């Protein structure tokens, strides 16, 4: 059930003795819709083969996204070559609101509620890399408290833990109709 999302298709041109020898590049994000996401860049003579290579590269380099509900743990500004993407968590119902690249990677990760904004290098590839760098900079409170050597309560805020418990209930207790 992996959700896949192409963001950009570009006809690139090598030049040779005869002339322009073309190919196609597909930027394909794929995700589980629940927090695992991967990015791929497929380069191939034909568009569908490019997309397939992108899918394969993505499913190879999947990575897991920290979440507290259907948003992210904390705000974070990821940088790439020159893509700069701030991410800011958001209350539920405001909706993932972002440009098509950040939007695609977030929607494939399953982040339905988030604030995002590209601040440099409108190019979708570097934007996606910047967004991914942000998501990799993300830090779940459990591993944070481990990193500190403390409880979770005295490093994380009560609002985050409230939403955490709420989401955990709505996951487990509401998985009853799926498990039975």
């Amino acid at each position: 059930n992996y959700i896949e999302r192409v963001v950009s298709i570009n006809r690139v041109s090598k030049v040779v003795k005869g002339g322009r020898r073309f190919s196609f590049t597909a930027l394909v994000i794929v995700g589980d819709g629940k927090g695992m996401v991967g990015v791929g860049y497929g380069k191939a003579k034909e568009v569908p083969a490019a997309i397939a290579k992108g899918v394969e590269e993505a499913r190879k380099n999947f990575f897991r996204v920290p979440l507290i509900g259907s948003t992210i743990t904390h705000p974070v500004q990821g940088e790439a070559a020159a893509g700069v993407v701030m991410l800011r968590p958001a209350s539920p119902g405001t909706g993932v609101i972002a440009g098509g690249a950040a939007r695609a990677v977030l929607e494939c990760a399953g982040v339905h509620d988030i604030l995002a904004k590209s601040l440099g290098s409108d190019n979708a590839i570097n934007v996606v890399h910047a967004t991914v760098a942000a998501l990799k900079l993300l830090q779940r409170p459990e591993e944070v408290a481990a990193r500190r050597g403390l409880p979770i309560e005295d490093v994380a805020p009560a609002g985050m833990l409230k939403a955490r418990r709420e989401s955990e209930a709505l996951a487990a207790a509401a998985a009853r109709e799926g498990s039975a």
Partner: protein, 131 residues
């Protein structure tokens, strides 16, 4: 010349944490020692010693890394710099990293995090963010 040993201390820390050093020796100041105490309490460092140098006193911070060399600190950021001092009221204190961080606040109740400062209802000079 030197203009804020607080930023010097944060930078020695950041660069040593990047280079995976285990120790950080630097000059001593009561303020830097109190900051180091805050970092120790919040778990961003292992310990800090105050020893004697040839002339004055030194701080030796024993940093902390996980088993797979996980940096116990991910960032340090001086905020109340000379040239631009920033002060926070108790209401508009800053939440570092959505709260998973720690902002060092200098107040007349002493040196205490943004959490402690909001608890005690006070504010003051925002020295650093140490997520």
């Amino acid at each position: 010349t030197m203009t804020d040993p607080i930023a010097d201390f944060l930078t020695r820390l950041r660069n040593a944490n990047s280079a995976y050093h285990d120790e950080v020796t630097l000059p001593h100041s009561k303020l830097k020692a109190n900051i180091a105490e805050i970092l120790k309490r919040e778990g961003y460092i292992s310990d800090y010693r105050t020893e004697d140098a040839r002339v004055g006193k030194s701080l030796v911070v024993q940093l902390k890394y996980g088993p797979s060399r996980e940096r116990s600190i991910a960032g340090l950021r001086r905020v109340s710099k000379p040239g631009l001092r920033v002060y926070a009221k108790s209401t508009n204190l800053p939440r570092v990293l959505g709260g998973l961080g720690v902002a060092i606040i200098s107040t007349s109740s002493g040196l205490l995090t943004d959490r402690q400062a909001a608890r005690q209802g006070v504010g003051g000079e925002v020295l650093a963010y140490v997520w």
